[PDB]
Amino acid sequence: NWIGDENLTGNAEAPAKDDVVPDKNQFRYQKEELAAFCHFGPNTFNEIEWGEHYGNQKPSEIFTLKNDFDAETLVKTLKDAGFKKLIVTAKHHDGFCIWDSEHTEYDVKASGYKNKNGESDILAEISKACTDQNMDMGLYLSPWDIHEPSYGYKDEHGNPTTPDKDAKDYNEFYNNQLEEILGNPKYGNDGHFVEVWMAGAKGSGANAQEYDFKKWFKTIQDNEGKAAGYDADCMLFGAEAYTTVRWIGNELGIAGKDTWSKSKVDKDKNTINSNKQGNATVGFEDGDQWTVPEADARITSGWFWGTKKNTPKTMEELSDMYFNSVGHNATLLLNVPPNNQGTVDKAILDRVTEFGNNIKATFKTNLAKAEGASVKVSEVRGGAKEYKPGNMIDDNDETYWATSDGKKSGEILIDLGKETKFDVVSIEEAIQNGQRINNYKVEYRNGDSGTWTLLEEGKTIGAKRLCRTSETTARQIKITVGTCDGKVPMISEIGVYKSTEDMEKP
Ligand SMILES: *O[C@@]1(*)[C@](*)(O*)C(*)(*)(O*)[O@](*)(*)[C]([C])[C@@]1(*)O*
Ligand SMILES: [Ca+2]
Ligand SMILES: [Ca+2]
Ligand SMILES: [Ca+2]
Ligand SMILES: [Cl-]
Ligand SMILES: [Cl-]
Ligand SMILES: [Mg+2]
Ligand SMILES: [Mg+2]
Ligand SMILES: [Mg+2]
């Protein structure tokens, strides 16, 4: 006996939230799904991924951009394709700064680069374009610095020594560059960054350098967090127990099929465990800190553009990436690298646009809301209109279906209203109240009776579960979701889709 939206006159309290919930930045990021990376700097000009070998070459020799950087085309293309954030390499491992920095002469101001307006600040140009399009921003500032003399332990003569005799403290240099960028309103979206990216990667032979994450965290939040009057702390990647955005554990855009947005942290020992299983961090059902699972990936073969690494991935590769990241409760952070002309190759921009168009066309028509279709449930929390099944098809992440206290599992019946072709089932857990679902099942059949065919079963839902199959014909789809004893499931949205040709399962 299936329950619809009609004649619900009951009362219920909201389900208790989980102990561990996303902050407002983490929740917005998980619902944005798509972010863009922008790697740009001397490596763009030198056919290399790690700029380890510049030595004493001048900024003007290694950063040779001769045209005004085209931030407007990049940002417009990304915004039109559905990307909601741009994370910029202000400084890569080479140490070259693409903003005008008073703390170093190893920067774009020293390179001789000037835009149409006589300014020398690529990070400011990108920030202006992002601000104009209301594109949120992240700041990538490499902890490892191959150039900066304060990096490592060196005496007043520049020769290796012990930490007590180190003449210049890299932790102060890095902190000062954080303050210089984050404290200046010409950087960010209207002065604001929502994510700081601290790469953990470092050369095997590089100098030892202990990082003062506590110091840097304070500078970040005093500029971009609750202490600065924002509604959440600025998200941090690569900051030990301060981490609020975790690395998915590979650079291929792949999240584990059952991914939890939670890690185990030790604030005293400054550690984080995100449960590495095979090639991905799958998190913990009982994790004590929300971490957004962030799958960083390259649209080309490298992070930097180059003449031998400018062919963009195919739609087959990018569709697989989408379903294995966004469809597995992870964000996709896709790099789109500018070229040595300060533009983006037309082939790369066209593939970004094609990828965005395919995602939009795939999710345009929710077959759970087509003519004659209906969404019903096995039970409605308190028989209350506040938890009605139509809350799963209202395109409002704040409204959800849930069951009554004592009912840890429920079923959703989607009647498509006729025999219907589909290949994607979409399920979104109301993660503002926690990630708690630990079993799901999706089944389908012809007609309105008889046995069910299994589409998919697994553990997690989280921000988004996409179940992608081969083209299937059905009249009805049944979704089962369950949590542990003493909790109830909360589903904010569901959908059924037929993907575009270039998003179909191979
Ligand atoms: O290069 C590379 C590095 O190493 C890492 O850390 O990250 C990524 C993104 C890139 O940048
Ligand atoms: Ca030093
Ligand atoms: Ca700021
Ligand atoms: Ca809803
Ligand atoms: Cl290389
Ligand atoms: Cl209840
Ligand atoms: Mg949404
Ligand atoms: Mg420009
Ligand atoms: Mg300077």
Numbering used by the authors: 7 to 512
What did the original publication write about this model?
To access this source of nutrients, gut bacteria encode α-l-fucosidases (fucosidases) which catalyze the hydrolysis of terminal α-l-fucosidic linkages. We identified and characterized a fucosidase from R. gnavus E1 with the capacity to recognize fucosylated glycans capped with sialic acid and to hydrolyze α1–3/4 fucosyl linkages in these substrates without the need to remove sialic acid. The enzymatic characterization of R. gnavus fucosidases focused on previously uncharacterized bacterial fucosidases revealed that fucosidase ATCC_03833 belongs to GH29-A while E1_10125 belongs to GH29-B subfamily.
In an attempt to obtain crystal structures in complex with the substrate, an active site mutant (E1_10125 D221A) was generated. Clear electron density was present for both α- and β-fucose anomers. It was not possible to obtain crystals of E1_10125 D221A in the absence of 2′FL. Attempts were made to displace the fucose molecule with other fucosylated ligands; however, these were unsuccessful, perhaps due to the substrate binding site being present at a tightly packed interface between two symmetry related protein molecules. Following 500 ns MD simulations of the E1_10125 D221A mutant and docking of the sLeX ligand, the molecular model showed that sialic acid ring sits in the neighboring subsite. Polar contacts are established between nearby residues, Glu262 and Trp269; in particular, and hydroxyl groups present at sialic acid C4, C8 and C9 positions. This analysis confirmed that the E1_10125 fucosidase enzyme shows an open binding site able to accommodate the sLeX ligand.
